[PDB]
Amino acid sequence: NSEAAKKALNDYIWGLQYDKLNILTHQGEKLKNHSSREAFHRPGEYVVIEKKKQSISNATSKLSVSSANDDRIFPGALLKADQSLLENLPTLIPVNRGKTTISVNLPGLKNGESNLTVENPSNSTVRTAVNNLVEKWIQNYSKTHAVPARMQYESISAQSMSQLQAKFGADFSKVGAPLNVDFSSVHKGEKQVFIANFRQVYYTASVDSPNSPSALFGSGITPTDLINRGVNSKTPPVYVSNVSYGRAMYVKFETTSKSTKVQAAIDAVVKILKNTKICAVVLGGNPGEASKVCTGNIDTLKDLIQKGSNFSAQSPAVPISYTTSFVKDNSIATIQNNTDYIETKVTSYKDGALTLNHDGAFVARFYVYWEELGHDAEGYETIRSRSWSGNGYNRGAHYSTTLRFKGNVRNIRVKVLGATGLAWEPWRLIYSKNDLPLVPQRNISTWGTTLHPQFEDKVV
């Protein structure tokens, strides 16, 4: 009976056991938590460069369509949930397929016009069919139905290539190569790098859940057929349930600036430091080319973006992402990318200055102490107390001096004494303060008379 064959195949798919939400898990670098500290001084600042292990976990259902897999992604394609998928170079299961129904969500396609059916679905026929429909829409409805883009935006501070593969897919080390990511620049911390992905979607082609798993195969495909071809619990089958068409691009941002809201700046121009030259890798758009554009400038990127904010409606748009569902229960398949990476973090401790000013009509004494972070011959960290060589000396008709400290100084202590003229108590503590931060400029000034001395501790 031709209906017992259906149950055999449906029974085989439903009989597979796998962790529905951990079977697709990409594992980048695994690293021990080895630390590192470089430290040195340069004009105005004491720079500390610290390296630390960090992890990133990113889940995603919308996988990217590259030129490496476009010949293989199409609505209704049968794929193996295996290493090939995690690598974003999936594998077509070589087996006859059943009739596939596809729906295109372009505006104006009403009643039944938005639906296709391909009886022998393949990358050639499904595309030829999807294009025919999009072109038929261009010819009949594009001039009275506008198609705005649905923007999907993602961005990250670049740290390592494995870190970027987790964020954008193992695919990325190939797609994002024309960006030529200056990774030498980040380990010295002379400038920051941000990679952003822009996806402008004009329309989608989708597949509704078939009535049963057997409907995706030829009327004659047998459980043995799938067992022979490696379709099982290790690598269960998925099918492309949705393809998004439109335009996509990667953009690089190399910032000398040391600001913090650098990302919030980038995130805000997509609708504040106009520093950073820009590098765009556009994937799709008009065939007349412009695959890579660079550099900035400022908002020729902003012009590049809006250029594809509406579907120009001259040709069918390019495929830019797809989504797969498990044949077993038609639930969306999520890929999980994890990796450890070394995050380089630069910290600047600005130099500071302490000025002592004595303008009082009395003899004064200044005492300045501070702590100092340093290293020894072996390079191990050391903390040491210090003293100003001028401590205790009598001062001043119009005495003034400025102490310039490197950024590695902290916790300044200050004391000021003045002559009283009293034999029983010749010196009195006019002022004293501990735990003083190293601000750019601080004045300890004293003035007044013997009987009524004055002072001020002022941050300029």
């Binding site: 104006g108 009403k110 009643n111 039944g112 016009e113 009949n140 409805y141």
Partner: protein, 77 residues
């Protein structure tokens, strides 16, 4: 003689129905934000009989005798 026929206003009627013997035409109407797709008598493809039966005050409509001809893009919103 088949027309898109739906029992109530749908923004996307996909049901292809063979009209009976009473009707000999396909009607489609846009009235406000609503759309109508019905089997219809050609003798009644006039503004007065269409508005009152559908209890609508203002509308544009289209009648035809070809199969599956009363599709939404026959009128323009």
């Amino acid at each position: 003689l088949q027309c898109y026929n739906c029992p109530n206003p749908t923004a996307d009627c996909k049901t292809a129905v063979n009209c009976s013997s009473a009707f000999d035409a396909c009607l489609i109407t846009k009235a406000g934000l609503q759309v109508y797709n019905k089997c219809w008598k050609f003798e009644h493809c006039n503004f007065n009989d269409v508005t009152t039966r559908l209890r609508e005050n203002e509308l544009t409509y289209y009648c035809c005798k070809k199969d599956l001809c009363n599709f939404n893009e026959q009128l323009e919103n």
